[PDB]
Amino acid sequence: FVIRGDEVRQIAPGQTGNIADYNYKLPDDFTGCVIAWNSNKLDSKVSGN
Amino acid sequence: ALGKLQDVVNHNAQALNTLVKQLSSKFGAISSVLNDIFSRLDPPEAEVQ
């Protein structure tokens, strides 16, 4: 999925926020890895994607 | 006259009071209140705390 850049820290266990509460929640004991990187040239057009 | 009986009771009461009063020491942690720890420390950190 894709989110805003300022919410990359929000994707983590023991987090609090909008997308955590109302878009996607991770478990506290989550084991694994997370990758996030600007997709401007992919999911950002000047007209707004 | 009979301090040799009284000292036993003194030692036991003193030991119990020390034991209960030890409930307030933080052991260097955030607090000695489990609810306070759970509230302030995110679950990942709260586990170790």
UniProtKB/Swiss-Prot annotation, chain A:
Domain of life: Viruses
Effect of mutating V46P: In strain: Omicron/XBB.1.5, Omicron/EG.5.1
Annotated stretches, region: Integrin-binding motif: 4-6
Subunit organization: Binds to host ACE2. RBD also interacts with the N-linked glycan on 'Asn-90' of ACE2. Cleavage of S generates a polybasic C-terminal sequence on S1 that binds to host Neuropilin-1 (NRP1) and Neuropilin-2 (NRP2) receptors. Interacts with host integrin alpha-5/beta-1 (ITGA5:ITGB1) and with ACE2 in complex with integrin alpha-5/beta-1 (ITGA5:ITGB1). May interact via cytoplasmic c-terminus with M protein. May interact (via N-terminus) with host bilirubin and biliverdin, thereby preventing antibody binding to the SARS-CoV-2 spike NTD via an allosteric mechanism.
Function, in words: Attaches the virion to the cell membrane by interacting with host receptor, initiating the infection. The major receptor is host ACE2. When S2/S2' has been cleaved, binding to the receptor triggers direct fusion at the cell membrane. When S2/S2' has not been cleaved, binding to the receptor results in internalization of the virus by endocytosis using host TFRC and GRM2 and leading to fusion of the virion membrane with the host endosomal membrane. Alternatively, may use NRP1/NRP2 and integrin as entry receptors.
Identification of the protein by name: Spike protein S1
Curated annotation (Swiss-Prot), chain B:
Recorded superkingdom: Viruses
Coiled-coil spans in chain: 6-49
Described function: Subunit of the fusion protein that is processed upon entry into the host cell. Mediates fusion of the virion and cellular membranes by functioning as a class I viral fusion protein. Contains a viral fusion peptide that is unmasked after S2 cleavage. This cleavage can occur at the cell membrane by host TMPRSS2 or during endocytosis by host CSTL. In either case, this triggers an extensive and irreversible conformational change that leads to fusion of the viral envelope with the cellular cytoplasmic membrane, releasing viral genomic RNA into the host cell cytoplasm.
Protein's name according to its UniProt entry: Spike protein S2'
Species of the source: Severe acute respiratory syndrome coronavirus 2
Lineage: Viruses, Riboviria, Orthornavirae, Pisuviricota, Pisoniviricetes
